[PDB]
Design a protein around this ligand. Structure first.
Ligand SMILES: *[C@@H]1O[C@H](CO)[C@@H](O[C@@H]2O[C@H](CO)[C@@H](O)[C@H](O)[C@H]2NC(C)=O)[C@H](O)[C@H]1NC(C)=O
Ligand SMILES: CC(=O)N[C@@H]1[C@@H](O)[C@H](O)[C@@H](CO)O[C@H]1O
Ligand SMILES: *[C@@H]1O[C@H](CO)[C@@H](O)[C@H](O)[C@H]1NC(C)=O
Ligand SMILES: *[C@@H]1O[C@H](CO)[C@@H](O)[C@H](O)[C@H]1NC(C)=O
Lengths: 147, 49, 147, 49
C-alpha cells in the first residue's frame, strides 16, 4: 500500500501520503502530525480466512494542507495463472528543482529467479510539481493479513 | 569567477575558450603540413637507401 | 503555467533573478539558473502600509543552510547561535528566525512594500494545454506547405 | 552635510573589516548600480584601500 515521504515525518514538517487501492490513488502533501502504525488484527493469519480490508486512518491530522491529485491507480495487477508466473513491479522516484517524477512498468516472467536477468526499460507515468525537500523514505505495508 | 556573477561569467569566459580553440587549431594545422613534408623526405631517403 | 506571488520590500526586488544570492534568495525563495518564464513587479504602497506600520508581513532570517531552488520552508524553531543548546523560547544566542517588516508611508522609495508575482512556463515535447488566440485551419498532405 | 558637486570631498577608508551587505539599511536607495564587479560578491574579494 503506497509510500510515504518526508524530512521528519512529524507535525513540524510537510510530508507526502501516496496511497493506492484497487481503483484509485490519492496523492496529497500535508503537514501530517502523526503516523502511528497500520492497523493490525493481531491475528496475523490467513490460512483459514481470506477476508482482510478497511484499515484506513494511517495519519492523525492535517491542519494546513493542499495539493490534492486523486487520479487513476498506479499499478494494475495482471492475473497470475498456472503458478510460476508473476509480474515484477518496477519503480523509481527522483526529486530535482521541486519536481517529482515516478517511472514504472510491469515486467512479466518471474518463474525461478528472484531478480531476473535480461533487459527492460521503464516508461514515464506522472510528474508532480509540488516541490519541497524529501530526505526520508518509508513504506505502508499492511500487515493485517500476510503469508 | 570570483569577481563576477554566473550570468555574466558565462558570457565572459566564452571569448577565452574561442581564442584558445583557435590557437590550438592553428598548431595542429601547421603540424599536419610539417608531418607531410617529413614523410616525403623519409620516402626519398628510403628510395635512396 | 505556474503563478506564485508574494510581497517583498522594494530594496530586494533585484534579488529575484537567476543566480542572485542574499538574504531573500538563499533562505526564502530561490530561482534556478536555467529559469524560463519571467517576473512582474509593481509598487503597492497604496494598500500595504499603515501610519503606525504594517506588521503582518514576515520573512525568514536564519537557516542552517541555503535551500534548493523552488523549495518551501514554513517550519518554526529556535536557531542555535551558540555552544549552549537552545531548548526553546528566546534566550541568549538563541534567536527566533522570523522577523517582521515595518512598512510605513513615510519611508521613501526602496523601503515601501513591493508586490511581485512571477510566472513560470515550460517548453517540452508534451501535449500542449494552454496558448494564445490562433485559429486552426485544414490539413494539407503531399504538398509543399508552411506548417 | 554633503559637499557641493564642484568641490566634492574625498574620504579614505582602510585598515578595517568591510561588510557591503549592510549598506541597504543606511540609505533608502534602490539601484546600487556597480560597474567593475557584481554587487553580490562585494564581501568576498580583498582590496588594498
Ligand atoms: C546610521 O543611520 C541608520 C538609520 O537609522 C542607523 O541604522 C540603525 O542601526 C541600529 C544599530 O545601532 C539598528 O538597530 C537599527 O535597526 C538601524 N535602523 C535603520 C533604519 O537602519 C545606524 O545605526 C546609523 N549609524 C550611525 C553610526 O549613526
Ligand atoms: C535543506 C537541505 O539540503 N537539507 C536539510 C537538512 O539540512 C535538515 O537538517 C533536514 C531536516 O529538516 O532537512 C533537509
Ligand atoms: C479506492 O479508493 C477510492 C477513494 O474514495 C474509492 O472511491 C474506491 O471505491 C476504492 N476502491 C474500491 C474497489 O472500493
Ligand atoms: C496552518 O495551521 C497550523 C495549525 O494551526 C499552523 O501551525 C500553521 O502555521 C498554519 N499555516 C499557515 C498559517 O500558513
Amino acid at each position: 500500500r503506497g509510500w510515504i515521504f518526508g524530512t521528519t515525518l512529524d507535525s513540524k514538517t510537510q510530508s507526502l501520503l501516496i496511497v493506492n487501492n484497487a481503483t484509485n490513488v490519492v496523492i496529497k502533501v500535508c503537514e501530517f502530525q502523526f503516523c502511528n502504525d497500520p492497523f493490525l488484527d493481531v491475528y496475523y493469519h490467513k490460512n483459514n480466512k481470506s477476508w482482510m480490508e478497511s484499515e484506513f486512518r494511517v495519519y492523525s491530522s492535517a491542519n494546513n494542507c493542499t495539493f490534492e491529485y486523486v487520479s487513476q491507480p498506479f499499478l494494475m495487477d495482471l492475473e497470475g495463472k498456472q503458478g510460476n508466473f508473476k509480474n515484477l513491479r518496477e519503480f523509481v522516484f527522483k526529486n530535482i528543482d521541486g519536481y517529482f517524477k515516478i517511472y514504472s512498468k510491469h515486467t512479466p516472467i518471474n518463474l525461478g529467479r528472484d531478480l531476473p536477468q535480461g533487459f527492460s526499460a521503464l516508461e514515464p507515468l506522472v510528474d508532480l510539481p509540488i516541490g519541497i525537500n524529501i530526505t526520508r523514505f518509508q513504506t505502508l505495508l499492511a500487515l493485517h493479513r500476510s503469508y | 569567477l570570483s569577481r563576477l556573477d554566473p550570468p555574466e561569467a558565462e558570457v565572459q569566459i566564452d571569448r577565452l575558450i574561442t581564442g584558445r580553440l583557435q590557437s590550438l587549431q592553428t598548431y595542429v594545422t601547421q603540424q599536419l603540413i610539417r608531418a607531410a613534408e617529413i614523410r616525403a623526405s623519409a620516402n626519398l631517403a628510403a628510395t635512396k637507401m | 503555467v505556474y503563478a506564485d506571488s508574494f510581497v517583498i520590500r522594494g530594496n530586494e526586488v533585484s534579488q529575484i533573478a537567476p543566480g542572485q544570492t542574499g538574504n531573500i534568495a538563499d533562505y526564502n525563495y530561490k530561482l534556478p539558473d536555467d529559469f524560463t518564464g519571467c517576473v512582474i513587479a509593481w509598487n503597492s504602497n497604496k494598500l500595504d502600509s499603515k501610519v503606525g506600520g504594517n506588521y503582518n508581513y514576515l520573512y525568514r532570517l536564519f537557516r542552517k543552510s541555503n535551500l534548493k531552488p523552488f523549495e518551501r520552508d514554513i517550519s518554526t524553531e529556535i536557531y542555535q547561535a551558540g555552544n549552549k543548546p537552545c531548548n526553546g523560547v528566546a534566550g541568549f544566542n538563541c534567536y527566533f528566525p522570523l522577523r517582521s517588516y515595518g512598512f510605513r508611508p513615510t519611508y521613501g522609495v526602496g523601503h515601501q512594500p513591493y508586490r511581485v508575482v512571477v510566472l513560470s512556463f515550460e517548453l517540452l515535447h508534451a501535449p500542449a494545454t494552454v496558448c494564445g488566440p490562433k485559429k486552426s485551419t485544414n490539413l494539407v498532405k503531399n504538398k509543399c506547405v508552411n506548417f | 552635510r554633503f559637499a557641493s558637486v564642484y568641490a566634492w570631498n574625498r574620504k579614505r577608508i582602510s585598515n578595517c573589516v568591510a561588510d557591503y551587505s549592510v549598506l541597504y539599511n543606511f540609505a533608502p536607495f534602490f539601484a546600487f548600480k556597480c560597474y567593475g564587479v557584481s554587487p553580490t560578491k562585494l564581501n568576498d574579494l580583498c582590496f588594498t584601500n
